[PDB]
Amino acid sequence: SLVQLWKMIFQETGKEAAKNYGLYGCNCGVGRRGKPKDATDSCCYVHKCCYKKVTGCNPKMDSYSYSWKNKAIVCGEKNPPCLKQVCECDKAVAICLRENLGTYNKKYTIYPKPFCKKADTC
């Protein structure tokens, strides 16, 4: 669920997830999609697009089972198809988030999403 993702974000980024990425760019956090602003927003772009490949669940409400191993995210204990995927979706968006931390814009942290150009289809 979305609380798990928020934790997941913090554990690889060290920043409070909703505080820093809840309104970042045009695809991070609540709201729709847009043409991404930077690599930080674009990995939120990838997250929302793997989130549409979910089938039988509510990712923002349904929790899953996962653990935080030797600084490595292991969702890999047996999970139902969706709950496996969203959590892998969350881990992938948690992992890339650490990969573009040097790019993070402090001005994009709360971004006016309506003004962003509409994203294509994933």
What is the residue whose two structure tokens read 């979305």? 2
28-58 burial, b at 16+ Cβ within 10 Å, e below that, comes to: bbebebbebbebbbbbbbbbbebbeebeebe
CATH number for 1-122 (one of 1.20.90.10, 1.20.1260.10, 3.90.850.10, 3.20.20.10): it is: 1.20.90.10
Q: What ranges do the domains of the chain cover? A: 1-122
List the resolution, Å: 2.6
Which tokens belong to 69? 């191993």
Binding-site residues from annotation for Ca(2+): 29, 31
4 closest CA partner among 59, 72, 50, 71 = 59
CA distances from residue 31 to 5, 86, 98, 108 in whole angstroms, order as listed: 16, 18, 22, 14
Which residue of the set 38, 47, 62, 120 is catalytic? 47
Which residue of the set 38, 41, 62, 90 is catalytic? 90
Catalytic, 41? Answer no
Query: How many CB atoms are located within 10 Å of the residue 21 CB?
Result: 27
Structure determined via: X-ray
